[PDB]
């Protein structure tokens, strides 16, 4: 049984590898060599935030490109006004070690979580004005790594227990739970359709789960380290995965394999964040070298570098409209570039 | 300048004042990370430091200064990822069952893993060898010998510069000093001075437990300032 099952699993893995290799007609480079060069993208700092107290460890852009949510390691969420730089909201968290934060697509709810293993969703449009604990849901036996809102009543979350889960706000329980990975899930990213979402864990692989059914339709197994960041392509057919090996990889849902590996010899520090622009040409990735990089999703050439921060960049995000890019680092300073 | 924008600026200034009032306390407080396996007496330590939650924060005041000890005993076995967030903390208190020789190997492995960590490379790791009474009773009973697990214990000489406590049997002193020497060897390895261990023999009832935290954190901050303030 165990031996025959192991042999069958090995044969299935070899068959999947052979099928993925047969469809590997060519690499993304051969086709992205004719496209004109993108040139240097020299982004300058338009805003400078000086409100955070501890290391900024999370961020996200809501439906409105003017409000920016950012979480600090002291248990504090801050919704900044990107345009006027003012502080729209300040939420003191009951958990000091917060590592994830997201802004609901309706602009009324904001999620957070971390080592507390309890995802807390606060409401911003409360009749009482003050920020209230809307839903402090629990059930995960591990630290929360990322949070993403699917609607005003459901939210997907990834915990250190190796299992992701879609919870319902009104019910406050798991709408659905996905099978556990080989390691702790570290990042999440929703597709434009909100039906499927790809998630990466400590194991060198990324699984594409479905919101309708709890099953990973695809499982990429290309990496040489633990994935710490992941972001979906604006179209939803591909997604970039970043690990601590200082190398990003663009996987595709249709081809079911890596398209291009963004890496450089002078970069030895791991990666912590990955994000795309509204078009997808510019792949932005935060590196532990106290600076962020921006490569060409097609050409893979170094398009720009952001060395404004002074500490390890923790997270970065592009606006829904692409007017600017926010970047939160461990220097307690979040910078908006454009 | 519009009136609503002026009101928003005033709200932002109020939020800045609030965040400054909060940062006052956040800066006047010291962060400590308590680590230890299930066999380790970290629970008894927290019970003694009384001067599905994956994190447990405990505030205790000593010598008119606060200490926020963070105990994590409700998470997965591996801790290479969630440990990164605990950088810049005051100190890391590692607990180990110095009496149970069976788990001593795993305790040393975990200590070496937490010491050679890339993110905690510049973070001191305080060491409390809890459960000294059980260790003394075991080494006096003679039924369990450290030689069975560590061959070096058979060719290990008692330190000449030792400081045996009053009323301690030679075997107890030799065993505790061998444990401390093993820990110091595992620590100094690739230490580079940026971070040093602080082995301390802690009993199960010794009220002077947080005093050890204070005495260790004082020297840790002194050493960290000698480098930042351009002294050494």
């Amino acid at each position, epitope marked *: 049984e165990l031996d025959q099952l192991r042999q069958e699993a090995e044969q299935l893995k070899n068959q999947i590898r052979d099928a993925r290799k047969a469809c590997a007609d060519a690499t993304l480079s051969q086709i992205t060599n004719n496209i004109d060069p993108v040139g240097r993208i020299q982004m300058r700092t338009r805003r400078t935030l000086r409100g955070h107290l501890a290391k900024i460890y999370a961020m996200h852009w809501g439906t409105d490109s003017r409000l920016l949510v950012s979480a600090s390691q002291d248990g504090k969420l801050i919704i900044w006004d990107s345009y006027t730089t003012n502080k729209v909201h300040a939420i003191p968290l009951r958990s000091s070690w917060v590592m994830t934060c997201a802004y609901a697509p309706s602009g009324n709810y904001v999620a957070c979580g971390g080592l507390d293993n309890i995802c807390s969703i606060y409401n911003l449009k409360t009749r*009482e*004005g003050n920020v209230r604990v809307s839903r402090e849901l629990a059930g995960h036996t591990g630290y929360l790594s990322c949070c993403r809102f699917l609607d005003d009543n459901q939210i997907v979350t990834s915990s250190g227990d190796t299992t992701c889960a879609l919870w319902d706000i009104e019910t406050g329980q798991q709408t659905t739970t996905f099978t556990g990975h080989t390691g702790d899930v570290m990042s999440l990213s929703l597709a434009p359709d909100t039906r499927l979402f790809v998630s990466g864990a400590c194991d060198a692989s990324a699984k594409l789960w479905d919101v309708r059914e709890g099953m990973c339709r695809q499982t990429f197994t290309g990496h040489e380290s633990d994935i710490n960041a992941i972001c979906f392509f604006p179209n939803g057919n591909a997604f970039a995965t970043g690990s601590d090996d200082a190398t990003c990889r663009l996987f595709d849902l249709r081809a079911d394999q890596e398209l291009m590996t963004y890496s450089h010899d002078n970069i030895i520090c791991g990666i912590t964040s990955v994000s795309f622009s509204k078009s997808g040409r510019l792949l932005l990735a935060g590196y532990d070298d106290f600076n962020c990089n921006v490569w060409d999703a097609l050409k893979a050439d170094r398009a720009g570098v952001l060395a404004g921060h002074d500490n390890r960049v923790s997270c970065l995000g592009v606006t829904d409209d692409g007017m600017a890019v926010a970047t939160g680092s461990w220097d307690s300073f979040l910078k908006i570039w454009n | 300048l519009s009136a609503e924008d*002026k*009101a*928003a600026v005033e709200r932002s200034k109020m939020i800045e004042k609030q965040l400054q009032k909060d940062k006052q306390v956040y800066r006047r407080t010291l962060r400590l990370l308590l680590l230890g396996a299930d066999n380790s007496g970290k629970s008894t330590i927290v019970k003694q430091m009384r001067i599905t939650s994956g994190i447990f924060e405990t505030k205790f005041q000593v010598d008119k200064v606060n200490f926020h000890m963070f105990d994590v005993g409700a998470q997965r076995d591996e801790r290479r990822k969630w440990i990164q967030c605990f950088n810049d903390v005051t100190a890391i208190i590692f607990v180990v069952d110095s009496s149970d020789y069976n788990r001593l190997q795993e305790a040393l492995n975990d200590f070496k893993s937490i010491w050679n960590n890339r993110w905690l490379r510049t973070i001191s790791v305080i060491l409390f060898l809890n459960k000294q009474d059980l260790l003394a009773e075991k080494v006096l009973a003679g039924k369990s010998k450290i030689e069975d697990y560590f061959p070096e214990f058979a060719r290990y000489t008692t330190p000449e510069d030792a400081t045996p406590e009053p009323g301690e049997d030679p075997r107890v002193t030799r065993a505790k000093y061998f444990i401390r020497k093993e820990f110091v060897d595992i620590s100094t390895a690739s230490g580079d001075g940026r971070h040093i261990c602080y082995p301390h023999f802690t009993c199960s009832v010794d009220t002077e437990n947080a005093r050890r935290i204070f005495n260790d954190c004082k020297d840790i901050i002194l050493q960290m300032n000698l480098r930042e303030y351009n002294l050494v």
Partner: single-chain antibody
Amino acid sequence: VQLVESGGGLVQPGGSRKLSCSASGFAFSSFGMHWVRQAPEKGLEWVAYISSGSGTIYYADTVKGRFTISRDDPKNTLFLQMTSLRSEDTAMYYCVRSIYYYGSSPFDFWGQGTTLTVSADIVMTQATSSVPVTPGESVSISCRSSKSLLHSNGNTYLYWFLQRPGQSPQLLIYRSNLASGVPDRFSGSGSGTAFTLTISRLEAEDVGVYYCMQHLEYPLTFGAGTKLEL
């Protein structure tokens, strides 16, 4: 959420009076307070404003010197001390909460107010004061202003308040952006100069007085008000 006002009554000319307002159901300090007067058989008129934490205070050019506003945050209360009360002071005063930030709706909750009887800013002018209409039809109230409320930031600093028989003015629109608790029947349109409030389907609860207000400059000025009856 409640704003209960008190302290009104009869006052002789030249006297004084402390109008109090107890707030509950929300963070009183987080919301700036506005004292707005309404003369008998007339429309609204802003009087005073106190920001959060008492960091900023403003009064109308006609009420400066006599009226002074203050707020006790420990008790979540507002006070307005009036001195040398004149004969024109006969009116009903209302306390309104307003929080200012992107996506907010300032002047969202109006208190019941209290009646007190005696014995160059932007002006809002409405064309019609009363429009007869029956349920089922749609209404289009117009509003004119002497200064363009379209600020360089692009925000339409226009507020619509609906005061019903026996109730206080209710916020309809704060910036075409519909207000909270108001059905989608009410809509706003127009440019920075002219404005239009459109009701697609009338109901028995829509009868009342609609007042327009500008918020470009701190010194406010309400319009004459358009009346809708059965």
